[PDB]
Amino acid sequence: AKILVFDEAARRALERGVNAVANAVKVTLGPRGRNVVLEKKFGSPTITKDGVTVAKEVELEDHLENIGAQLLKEVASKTNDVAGDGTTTATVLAQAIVREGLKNVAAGANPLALKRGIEKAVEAAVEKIKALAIP
Amino acid sequence: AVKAPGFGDRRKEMLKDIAAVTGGTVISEELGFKLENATLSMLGRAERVRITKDETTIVGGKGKKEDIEARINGIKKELETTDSEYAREKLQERLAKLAGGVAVIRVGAATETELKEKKHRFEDALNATRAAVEEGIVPGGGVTLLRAISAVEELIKKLEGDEATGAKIVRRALEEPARQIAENAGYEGSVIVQQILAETKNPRYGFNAATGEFVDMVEAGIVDPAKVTRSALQNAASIGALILTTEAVVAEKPE
Amino acid sequence: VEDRKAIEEVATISANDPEVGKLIADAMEKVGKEGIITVEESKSLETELKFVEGYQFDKGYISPYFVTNPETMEAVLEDAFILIVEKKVSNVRELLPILEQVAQTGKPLLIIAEDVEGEALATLVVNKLRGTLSVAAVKAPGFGDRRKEMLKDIAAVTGGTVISEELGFKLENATLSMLGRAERVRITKDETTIVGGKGKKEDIEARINGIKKELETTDSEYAREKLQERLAKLAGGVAVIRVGAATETELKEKKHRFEDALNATRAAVEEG
Amino acid sequence: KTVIKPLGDRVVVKRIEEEPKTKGGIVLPDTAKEKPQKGKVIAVGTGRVLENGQRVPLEVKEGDIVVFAKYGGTEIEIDGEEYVILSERDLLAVLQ
Amino acid sequence: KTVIKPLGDRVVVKRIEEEPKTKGGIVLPDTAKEKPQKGKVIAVGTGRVLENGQRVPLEVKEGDIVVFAKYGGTEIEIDGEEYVILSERDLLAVLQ
Ligand SMILES: Nc1ncnc2c1ncn2[C@@H]1O[C@H](COP(=O)(O)OP(=O)(O)O)[C@@H](O)[C@H]1O
Ligand SMILES: [Mg+2]
């Protein structure tokens, strides 16, 4: 009942899913962002500009690609939970990190180390965010 | 006023714990006591007591030392008969509370998925520690099992026929762990395993798959609970040998 | 078959393992050919052969206070009396008479009743403590009509009377003569071992001889093991091999080999 | 300090708790032993006015040990102490 | 050492357990046989104070075998022994 996918085959699949969702979402980002139309089971549809709302409706037919779609959705919601806004921005940042990163993995990079660096980099990044915060 | 601790026959046994800790007496409706007939003589006493919206802490219990110990060794001489690991965790937090020693690591993470794994790593770490205390510690990175080879080797010299072949099988197998570790690290399994098996002065000599340097595994802090090692191998070899004896299989005819 | 060797052989072969044939021989020897051997699932990687004393059942004290030993958390009772109630016991009045008759006899008391709750229990506890009388209350042996049948077993072996409407008795109307005795009685947190029962040859040699006669007409794997588990307790010479293994799969087979080895031994003794 | 004044045949007994042990020495739990059926009279009252107006005195003296069916008769406390207001009917006998 | 002092025509009987067997030799189970309706008086009391101050003595001597409606009359124990405080009404007859 199971299927075992390895290496790049696996990463590409996941990535496809990640992008599937991310690209439906990013269409809303910013002031010139536009709306997505989510079909509802009975009434008229939902016409939003909200990241998580769209992200949550996305369900892919291919198992592996879907798993990726999910992981990205999590990025979206957990952000909605912790702040209620900036869901689109989190999605985009995730997509970005996934591609530029998956590329480096293909190039032979040790993912574990890539993680450490990403972590350190984020810390430095967050610190600078605070540093520019105005009450 | 505060509700009893546990439920069922455990809040009953816990009340006693609380008793022996404060020194007081449990007004056990089945021991034959009446609340009306209670006395200051049968009351628990403590240096301090904190009560929050949902927590109760009994500091400086005046209980009798023998009462606590006897309350304790009762859980101990009982755990050595408890199976379901869940029951062994219940009869543990009691013996923990009673020994005034309960630590709690609250794992944090940015996401559920990360958290669930981070949390898991701690749990594994603990299981390791527990096993380390029980049976000891050995050099890691599969090094310890590689050192087992020479033993099998010596054994082989005393063996014949297929039985000796059998031994040889283990001999080779013993290298797998070391190999795979190195391999997943980006190195040559066979190569590394050779250099390790090479320097036979100090058995603690092994490969640090993380830095890429041969070192004294113990001194480097790369150690493993001798319990896990012994287990892994015994379990592996248990099923493994079984398989080699297969000569038939009766399965379900494909859908 | 006439000796330890002959048996060790038969078993070693049927199980295709010397070790297995050894334990089966060891046990068989120290339990006689009319004995009883049992195969159980040890917990360690190693298999162990262990012998049992008398009639025992997986039920222990209803309250710790009954302990005779601190470290062991057990309750030994030299030459104790054994009350045997079929129904529950929570009403004190009914007890008091025997509790005294015995308290005055200054001997240990083992109460085997369907249960002991409330002040009935409380009295036992308290009195135990104040050196009034040394008691221990162990719940019913089995469950259902099965225990009602085991209570007659515990009876038989100890030499007492089932306090139930059948035998025509009533709790209060007890006697220092209507119950059973032993030579010892170990009771851990969850197990009882009535060592050296006083009951008589005929009463058991028919309580066990009737459990066997009904067994020959029970093809239910459940009812089959339940009547052989009763026919077990009802004997002193009881061996028990606790088979060990690293994995469930290995264990299940190892365990099976022992069982085959026994069946062989049995048949060996029968027809040669 | 106050004095109890029973009426038509009502006495005022003060229960007596049974010994901690029994005749066998069996220390009974405070859940096993029930309310005593004994007590000393602390205040007899006017006798019972029969049908021809004749007040038959209570066969019980102010201070005897009485045996009564523990279940009947009202109970009350006064100045930190509880007693039982029983009638003659409830009085079964006296311990000498 | 204590002695019982029954009141208004109340006697103090000490039940008598029926024989183990019956008139036929049938050993009955102690679940079948009920509380005896028999016993010896151990303490008769003041007679019953009639309508005109007259205390009618109890037709029972301190030591006879009495037959009573087993169901009635309070019961009590004293110094390790239980008896029954019955009235005159509950007394049905005497065995000679
Ligand atoms: N007029 C604007 N000029 C530049 N950036 C803007 C303007 N209006 C909004 N933004 C920015 O657009 C970003 C996200 O907008 P939005 O569509 O609401 O996405 P999200 O779901 O991530 O909150 C923010 O960084 C916000 O500051
Ligand atoms: Mg065979």
Side-chain angles (χ1 to χ4, degrees), chain A residues 28-31 33 49-52 85-90:
Chain A
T28 66
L29 192 63
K49 179 174 175 307
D50 184 279
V52 265
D85 187 38
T87 31
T88 300
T89 293

Short mmCIF file of all heavy atoms in Angstrom, two decimals, chain A residues 28-31 33 49-52 85-90, ligand 1:
data_model
loop_
_atom_site.label_atom_id
_atom_site.label_comp_id
_atom_site.label_asym_id
_atom_site.label_seq_id
_atom_site.Cartn_x
_atom_site.Cartn_y
_atom_site.Cartn_z
N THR A 28 -1.86 37.08 -4.10
CA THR A 28 -2.52 38.07 -3.25
C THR A 28 -1.60 39.09 -2.60
O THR A 28 -2.02 40.22 -2.34
CB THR A 28 -3.26 37.37 -2.12
OG1 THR A 28 -2.30 36.74 -1.27
CG2 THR A 28 -4.17 36.29 -2.68
N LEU A 29 -0.36 38.68 -2.36
CA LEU A 29 0.64 39.53 -1.71
C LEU A 29 0.70 40.98 -2.15
O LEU A 29 0.67 41.28 -3.36
CB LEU A 29 2.03 38.93 -1.87
CG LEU A 29 3.08 39.59 -0.98
CD1 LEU A 29 2.73 39.38 0.48
CD2 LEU A 29 4.44 38.98 -1.27
N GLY A 30 0.79 41.86 -1.16
CA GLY A 30 0.91 43.30 -1.40
C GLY A 30 -0.35 44.07 -1.70
O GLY A 30 -1.45 43.52 -1.75
N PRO A 31 -0.21 45.38 -1.91
CA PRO A 31 -1.32 46.30 -2.22
C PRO A 31 -1.94 46.08 -3.59
O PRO A 31 -3.12 46.36 -3.78
CB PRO A 31 -0.67 47.69 -2.14
CG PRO A 31 0.78 47.42 -2.54
CD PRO A 31 1.09 46.09 -1.84
N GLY A 33 -1.91 43.17 -4.94
CA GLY A 33 -2.29 41.77 -4.93
C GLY A 33 -3.74 41.61 -5.37
O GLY A 33 -4.57 42.53 -5.20
N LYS A 49 -8.27 37.33 -0.30
CA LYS A 49 -6.95 37.90 -0.57
C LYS A 49 -6.09 37.44 0.60
O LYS A 49 -4.97 37.91 0.81
CB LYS A 49 -7.02 39.40 -0.61
CG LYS A 49 -5.68 40.07 -0.85
CD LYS A 49 -5.83 41.59 -1.04
CE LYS A 49 -4.48 42.25 -1.16
NZ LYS A 49 -3.60 41.88 -0.02
N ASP A 50 -6.63 36.47 1.34
CA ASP A 50 -5.99 35.92 2.50
C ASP A 50 -5.21 34.65 2.22
O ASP A 50 -5.75 33.66 1.71
CB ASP A 50 -7.05 35.69 3.61
CG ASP A 50 -6.45 35.19 4.92
OD1 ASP A 50 -6.18 33.98 5.05
OD2 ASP A 50 -6.25 36.02 5.84
N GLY A 51 -3.93 34.69 2.57
CA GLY A 51 -3.08 33.53 2.39
C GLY A 51 -3.66 32.23 2.90
O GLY A 51 -4.17 31.45 2.11
N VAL A 52 -3.60 31.99 4.22
CA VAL A 52 -4.11 30.75 4.82
C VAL A 52 -5.45 30.27 4.29
O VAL A 52 -5.65 29.06 4.12
CB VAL A 52 -4.26 30.84 6.37
CG1 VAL A 52 -3.03 30.30 7.05
CG2 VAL A 52 -4.55 32.29 6.78
N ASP A 85 -1.89 37.55 10.83
CA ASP A 85 -1.60 38.29 9.61
C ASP A 85 -0.21 37.89 9.13
O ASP A 85 0.55 37.28 9.89
CB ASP A 85 -1.70 39.80 9.84
CG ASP A 85 -1.57 40.59 8.57
OD1 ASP A 85 -2.11 40.13 7.53
OD2 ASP A 85 -0.94 41.67 8.60
N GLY A 86 0.10 38.21 7.87
CA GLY A 86 1.39 37.86 7.30
C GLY A 86 1.52 36.40 6.86
O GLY A 86 2.62 35.84 6.81
N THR A 87 0.39 35.78 6.54
CA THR A 87 0.41 34.39 6.10
C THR A 87 1.01 34.26 4.70
O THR A 87 1.78 33.34 4.43
CB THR A 87 -1.00 33.79 6.08
OG1 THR A 87 -1.95 34.82 5.78
CG2 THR A 87 -1.31 33.17 7.42
N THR A 88 0.65 35.17 3.81
CA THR A 88 1.19 35.13 2.46
C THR A 88 2.72 35.26 2.51
O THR A 88 3.44 34.45 1.91
CB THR A 88 0.60 36.27 1.63
OG1 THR A 88 -0.83 36.13 1.57
CG2 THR A 88 1.21 36.28 0.23
N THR A 89 3.19 36.29 3.23
CA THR A 89 4.61 36.54 3.39
C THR A 89 5.37 35.30 3.89
O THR A 89 6.49 35.03 3.47
CB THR A 89 4.87 37.67 4.39
OG1 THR A 89 4.40 38.91 3.86
CG2 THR A 89 6.35 37.78 4.67
N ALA A 90 4.77 34.54 4.79
CA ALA A 90 5.44 33.37 5.30
C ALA A 90 5.56 32.29 4.23
O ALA A 90 6.57 31.58 4.15
CB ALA A 90 4.70 32.83 6.52
N1 LIG F 1 1.21 50.60 -0.23
C1 LIG F 1 2.09 49.62 0.05
N2 LIG F 1 3.40 49.75 -0.39
C2 LIG F 1 4.35 48.79 -0.14
N3 LIG F 1 3.97 47.69 0.57
C3 LIG F 1 2.68 47.51 1.04
C4 LIG F 1 1.69 48.48 0.78
N4 LIG F 1 0.55 48.06 1.32
C5 LIG F 1 0.80 46.89 1.91
N5 LIG F 1 2.10 46.55 1.74
C6 LIG F 1 2.82 45.35 2.25
O1 LIG F 1 2.34 44.14 1.66
C7 LIG F 1 2.75 43.06 2.53
C8 LIG F 1 1.76 41.88 2.74
O2 LIG F 1 0.46 42.26 2.35
P1 LIG F 1 -0.74 41.25 2.37
O3 LIG F 1 -1.35 41.10 1.05
O4 LIG F 1 -1.75 41.74 3.30
O5 LIG F 1 -0.12 39.88 2.83
P2 LIG F 1 -0.11 39.05 4.16
O6 LIG F 1 -1.15 37.97 4.12
O7 LIG F 1 1.33 38.38 4.14
O8 LIG F 1 -0.32 39.94 5.33
C9 LIG F 1 3.32 43.73 3.79
O9 LIG F 1 4.76 43.64 3.86
C10 LIG F 1 2.80 45.18 3.71
O10 LIG F 1 3.59 46.12 4.44
#
